[PDB]
């Protein structure tokens, strides 16, 4: 299924009913299409007590697609501004902060000195659509993704590029370990609905 | 017969600004013209812009970075400078001082400069 966002709003959104552990290691990867055109906005977000910036991929306006973890930034080599259905994967690793970026199963770029040595804190708000500036909460309309998203899935490791290859692809289906997207899993408010989704075939034409 | 240390980086916002300064611990900074360079993630060093020793001519690697950027120098102070005005996330990178007089070439280490716009928001 797909959670669409069809406005450009501070009151419609997702949001992720399992919460995060501690994480020293994942990959987030999910389907989007945003509509958006000064930048997708904000396709998903992590907010903790102490940091409501914990995890956060953003696009804010013209300027370039960022990943934040704890309020450190990279930019990342996404282009999925443009419309269309894409697929991406980001994995990170607390170990020198290792970052990679995949965009429809091919690797755009690495990075390094991402937040190293962080953990993930546990126990905060996956929100979808929005941007936080309080746990689950205090969204900012300029900041949100507007379109579509399928597909959210967190696991606890750095998956292989073979494995992201099998998941862009939909040859896979195996859900995040952490986070898997089932319809119990993913609470809609404010205007957002889910619906099921087209194929990865029908996506990419 | 240099040692370039340069200092004035860190983390900033768009649109913000942000003085670079490069300082020769010796005393012969006016035998050399002086630049700024910068490297950001996975990509070649490029030019930002160069001075002449005595300051009265310099030269931007083109009109966008000439637009917001300025080099000085202060020969008294062993000194070149960077401002950098209306800061984008592009110009994220570290920055690099070089001394160039005849044959010989000289580098600092480097300071970085982090330019996010959604850092803090
Ligand atoms: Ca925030
Ligand atoms: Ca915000
Ligand atoms: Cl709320
Ligand atoms: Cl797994």
């Known amino acids: 299924f797909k959670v669409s966002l069809p406005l450009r709003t501070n009151y419609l959104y997702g949001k992720i009913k399992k919460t995060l552990p501690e994480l020293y290691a994942f990959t987030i990867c999910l389907w989007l299409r945003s509509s958006a055109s000064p930048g997708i906005g904000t396709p998903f977000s992590y907010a903790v007590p102490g940091q409501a910036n914990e995890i956060v991929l953003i696009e804010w306006g013209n300027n370039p697609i960022e990943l934040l973890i704890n309020d450190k930034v990279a930019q990342l080599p996404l282009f999925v501004s443009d419309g269309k259905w894409h697929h991406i994967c980001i994995t990170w690793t607390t170990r020198d902060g290792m970052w990679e970026a995949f965009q429809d199963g091919e690797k755009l770029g690495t990075g390094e000195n991402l937040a190293p040595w962080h953990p993930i804190k546990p126990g905060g708000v996956l929100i979808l659509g929005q941007e936080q500036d309080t746990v689950g909460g205090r969204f900012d309309a300029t900041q949100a993704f507007v379109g579509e998203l399928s597909q959210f899935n967190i696991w606890d490791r750095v998956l292989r590029a073979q494995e992201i290859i099998n998941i862009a692809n939909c040859s896979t289906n195996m859900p995040g370990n952490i986070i898997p997207w089932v319809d119990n899993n993913v609470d809609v408010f404010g205007g957002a609905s889910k619906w099921p989704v087209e194929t990865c075939e029908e996506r990419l034409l | 017969q240099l040692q370039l240390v340069e200092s004035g980086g860190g983390l900033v916002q768009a649109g913000d600004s942000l003085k670079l300064s490069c300082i020769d611990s010796?005393?012969?900074?006016?035998?050399?013209?002086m630049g700024w360079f910068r490297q950001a993630p996975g990509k070649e060093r490029e030019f930002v812009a160069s001075?002449?020793?005595?300051?009265?001519?310099?030269?931007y690697a083109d009109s966008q970075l000439k637009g917001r950027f300025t080099i000085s120098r202060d020969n008294a102070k062993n000194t070149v400078y960077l401002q950098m005005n209306s800061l984008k996330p592009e110009d994220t990178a570290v920055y690099y001082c070089?001394?160039?007089?005849?044959?010989?070439?000289?580098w600092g280490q480097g300071t970085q400069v982090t330019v996010s716009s959604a850092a803090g928001h």
């Open positions: 070089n001394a160039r007089a005849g044959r010989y070439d000289y």
């Open positions: 010796g005393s012969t900074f006016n035998l050399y013209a």
């Open positions: 001075i002449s020793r005595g300051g009265g001519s310099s030269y």
